[PDB]
Subunit: 347 residues, 3 copies
């Protein structure tokens, strides 16, 4: 970020990036120009010696379509909070679900991965979410270095109209009932970490009717993660088991899913950072004769070259291991390989 | 505001807020997450010793819906102007109608009130409006301390298509023909002010043919207001009598309406600011057997706690005194109570 | 632009304008309030002694419609790049097509002209375009002041769906196949410059099947321009011959078009800058019996008064010389005059 203001106990950082990005793929819904930018503000005010107030907004602005195209910009984050000494912090707004406190460890590919693969945004507490109240505590009240935890609650974000509605209604794939989540990460020593996360949300009536697949009163996720970040090497893995919470493309939700991501990278001193990763999401107990089906399955190979802290370039290659079948077709799941080339200015 | 630039006769202030906000109500169209942010810029250039040029933009960005939701951001204000010594100022663009120079005195509730109640936005010259040319004068050319006035003109903002169209067409509820407004405020003593405002706008053919209620060539408003702002106390009231200008929910406009708002607040030195208010809008001479009907009626009780000038939190309680009847049902007027809880970072 | 950050090898400029603008016309699709603003960020990082990284984003935000209106903001530019000493620069993203390196010389009217007349945006490489990779060389490797050249490539931006699709699909009028462009400008004498530009793009299947007019596998443009900018006088002209690249209003593309623009301006030291211009676009070989038709034809008279570098005001008169006929009617081409009045704050 770029600190543009710091006066009378208030500071503002302007941050973002401009990514000149192109995808090459046989999948025409993915192929082509993908240029976009992000811009945001992070503000912090010192209220007193122990209390600080804060706010953060992050906006995504696509720049790959025309000036007459619709729906090209959206808010990723918008929350306000308070932090009190070692007693912890509390924030509310649009923010990450606590499951991402651990799954973020494998969200480090040059381009692919993250909330475009084993989980998505507005997908219960797995990525960015509306209306999350989050309590966080670092170093266990200042008593245990490296031990962090979080407790999170999310109110229902319901249907557009009818009995299940809320003011901010949306379609079944992005709805949620009241829910909660927890996370615990332990940086046991500089560079070695283990993490766990859990979430439990009520599902909505539209989630149990509109989509073809997935039925159940509650959505749940269980995540374990490991991270090694030392000696110029980055290794991470995350395993998440879900119930009625993983999307099976447009078909609905998987009654059960097993998601696994693993990544290995090396950072050369001159700036090059090669990366190899494997990601999979296996749906189980799917209705309508599907049984067990792969929702996502690919090997990723790529590299980022960091010119400095403000400029980088990258290549990423998604080697898609899914086969074309009635499940991927009917769910709108891409089975093609993709090559991305990006040139990024960051601030 | 945060001054981020001040060089060679030009200054720029960045301002805004991030409001982590949740509403609790039996009305499903308002219940739920209401998080949003505002961001704006106020610029001013010293052209010469007495002439200054200025501009202001204010943007509202909702953050309570998904990244694939539409129409989540909009411009509240955007105008450019010139100010010259005691001769006054002139600006043009999207700005407040001059009726708000007086009705703004009661727009101080912790969350509710303002252009969501007795008047709205794009509602003739009662709130924010497109295409307003506004002349303002402070202290009557420097001759009368505390006496301010404004004169404003608004060109037609017509239908989307047909004979009544303009480039920036919209539906009947937000249309207007040529309009004029004036305001005058006087600080009688230190902390005590009185104000008056008047507006007169031509109504469009769609306003006089499409909606169920309200018919007349012109919309007209008359406002009187009073304010006491001293000794940590804030008291204000505004009374506005309107003709063919107050929306009767979705049914059109009230042939006549009488709007009244009153508020009392106290600012404790430690930061707490309790507030109590009463707001009503009474429609008269409504067609179709409605006769006289309450369009809005509620008591508001709340409080804001200011941690400092950059962070606050609040609770607001709208105690809705409207009864469920054929008018509130057919007009889509909410009769339910609402509780709002907000946590706000400001810059 | 306003430099708002400059630390540790990175600098950021914030720029933009707020234009309080009103059009007066018998054409109801352009008459009325036209207020808008632009905001952008320009960043540059010093990577090493010779290499710099950069990024630029420019956003257009309309402020002439209501807060409930759709599609009011869009990205004009978003690109990232690298510049290596005098060897040149390379950038990729949404940026101007290199034909504008020469046609921009007549895009100097107080309000009209530019990409709203003989060419448009997302119109091959004639104005702003998605997915352009651009190499630029300034001042011939730093050896010849004013001798500039560019080489540009654009990937296909295809249909919304079907065989011709790309991820960022759009309608036929804004599609393009793979394309290339080049430009070269230089000074002949002090204050006198000449410029040439060429572009060649593949056309798309929808361009050759959906609209009635224009058929061909390739879109090409050839431009020559001249500019005199000295002694307070500005004179410029541009002539462009196109094949399957100039829009024939809503009916398709002209198989051939000849575009000509000429402008004369004078800059008074006190700030007034009168301007007189003539613009025409002649379509040739149009199908359906249209044959040769004027697509655009007008004289422009106006003036801008610059208060300083941050504030200006203007008037512009478009004196439309087109005759009303079956072509202008069926193509939706405006034959009416327009008067614009603007007051602009810039940063
Ligand atoms: C400001 C904080 C708002 C808290 C909202 C809690 C959500 C509860 C929904 C049930
Ligand atoms: C040990 C870390 C190895 C990283 C491998 C990256 C190759 C692409
Ligand atoms: C000292 C020369 C400046 C003359 C004033 C410029 C005119 C615009 C002022 C409008 C204010 C209302
Ligand atoms: C400076 C000219 C502004 C336009 C004048 C509008 C006058 C409106 C009031 C009279 C209306 C007469 C009945 C239509
Ligand atoms: C130029 C000032 C007059 C404009 C008045 C517009 C409203 C007219 C209402 C009818 C009288
Ligand atoms: C000069 C000191 C005056 C003290 C100001 C505090 C007064 C609180 C007023 C409450 C009155 C409510 C009626
Ligand atoms: C301290 C004064 C508060 C007034 C509260 C009004 C209560 C609601 C009355 C209608 C039910
Ligand atoms: C002075 C602030 C009082 C408002 C508290 C809100 C009361 C909640 C009532 C819910 C039933
Ligand atoms: C980051 C630069 C990417 C350039 C991509 C060029 C598009 C090729 C289309 C075939
Ligand atoms: C790097 C060299 C660039 C050369 C550009 C050639 C452009 C052709 C221009 C022809 C102008 C004809 C106008 C009808
Ligand atoms: C100074 C230019 C601002 C635009 C003026 C608009 C005139 C009022 C509309 C009729
Ligand atoms: Li299930
Ligand atoms: Li595959
Ligand atoms: Li009436």
């Amino acid at each position: 970020g770029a600190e543009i203001y710091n006066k009378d106990g208030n500071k503002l950082d302007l941050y973002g990036k401009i990514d000149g990005l192109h995808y090459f793929s046989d999948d025409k819904s993915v192929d082509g120009d993908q240029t976009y930018m992000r811009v945001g503000v992070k503000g912090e005010t010192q209220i007193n010696d122990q209390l600080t107030g804060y706010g953060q907004w992050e906006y995504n602005v696509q720049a790959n379509n025309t000036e007459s195209s619709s729906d090209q910009a959206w808010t990723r984050l918008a929350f306000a909070g308070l932090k009190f000494g070692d007693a912890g912090s509390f924030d509310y707004g649009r923010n990450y679900g606590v499951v991402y406190d651990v799954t973020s460890w494998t969200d480090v590919l040059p381009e692919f991965g993250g909330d475009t693969d084993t989980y998505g945004s507005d997908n219960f507490l797995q990525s960015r979410a509306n209306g999350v109240a989050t309590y966080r505590n670092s170093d266990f009240f200042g008593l245990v270095d490296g031990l962090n935890f979080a407790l999170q609650y999310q109110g229902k974000n319901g249907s557009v109209s009818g009995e299940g509605a809320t003011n901010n209604g949306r379609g079944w794939s992005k709805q949620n009932g009241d829910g909660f989540g927890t996370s615990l990460t332990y940086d046991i020593w500089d560079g070695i970490s283990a993490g766990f996360a859990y979430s439990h949300s009520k599902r909505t009536d539209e989630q149990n009717s509109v989509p073809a697949l997935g039925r159940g009163d509650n959505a749940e996720t269980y995540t374990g993660g490991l991270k090694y970040d030392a000696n110029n090497i980055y290794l991470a893995s995350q395993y998440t088991q879900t119930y009625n919470a993983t999307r099976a493309g447009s078909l609905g939700f998987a009654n059960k899913a097993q998601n696994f991501e693993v990544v290995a990278q090396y950072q050369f001193d001159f700036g090059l950072r090669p990366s190899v990763a494997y990601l999979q999401s296996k749906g189980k107990d799917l209705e309508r004769g599907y049984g067990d089906q792969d929702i996502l399955k690919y090997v990723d190979v790529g590299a980022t070259y960091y010119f400095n802290k403000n400029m980088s370039t990258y290549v990423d290659y998604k080697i898609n291991l899914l086969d074309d079948n009635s499940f991927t077709r009917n769910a709108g799941i891409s089975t093609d390989d993709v090559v991305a080339l990006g040139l990024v200015y960051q601030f």
